[PDB]
Design a protein around this ligand. Structure first.
Ligand code: HEM
Length: 142
């Protein structure tokens, strides 16, 4: 249950991000590594000491999952099976549920750099509710 006005703030903001999803994704992950640098060694070439996802491929996959959430922002329930399963995949490779707040922060930081004054209080609140619903779905696997 997200109403039209808030759904539209998400859809509009997401169109701005979707002009350049790898460039915005690199901003999300640059912030995430600043907050939680222990996550870098899960990526190919992310380790001091050298199956692992490659960094830009995984960004594409991340932005494709957010795209699906944005497409279903009014009701996320067609997605709960996938998200439950995606949460389990992440848990199994050592990504704690605690990292959900770090990804959240990093997502809000990427949106704020993409949108400037168009990142309105209501846009921020709507994206937090959307992200929270996604993490809730995923945390039935974490
Ligand atoms: C701390 C944050 C994250 C880390 C460290 C991370 C890391 C990884 C790792 C290691 C894999 C490979 C797992 C495996 O082979 O089973 C993976 C797969 C994936 N990640 Fe992430 N991920 C993170 C966040 C996200 C988020 C927030 C999304 C989407 C909202 C996402 C989307 C995906 C997708 C679609 C895959 C492919 C799943 C599959 O192999 O079936 N990731 N990620």
């Amino acid at each position: 249950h997200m109403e039209r006005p808030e759904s539209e703030l998400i859809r509009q903001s997401w169109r701005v991000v979707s002009r350049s999803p790898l460039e915005h994704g690199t901003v999300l992950f640059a912030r995430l590594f600043a907050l939680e640098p222990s996550l870098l060694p899960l990526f190919q070439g992310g380790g001091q000491f050298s199956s692992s996802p490659e960094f830009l491929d995984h960004i594409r996959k991340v932005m494709l999952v957010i795209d699906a959430a944005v497409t279903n922002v009014e009701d996320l329930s067609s997605l709960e099976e996938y998200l439950t399963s995606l949460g389990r995949k992440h848990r199994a490779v050592g990504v704690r549920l605690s990292s959900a707040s770090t990804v959240g922060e990093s997502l809000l930081y990427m949106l704020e750099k993409s949108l400037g004054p168009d990142f309105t209080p209501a846009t921020r609140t709507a994206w937090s509710r959307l992200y929270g619903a996604v993490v809730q779905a995923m945390s039935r696997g974490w």
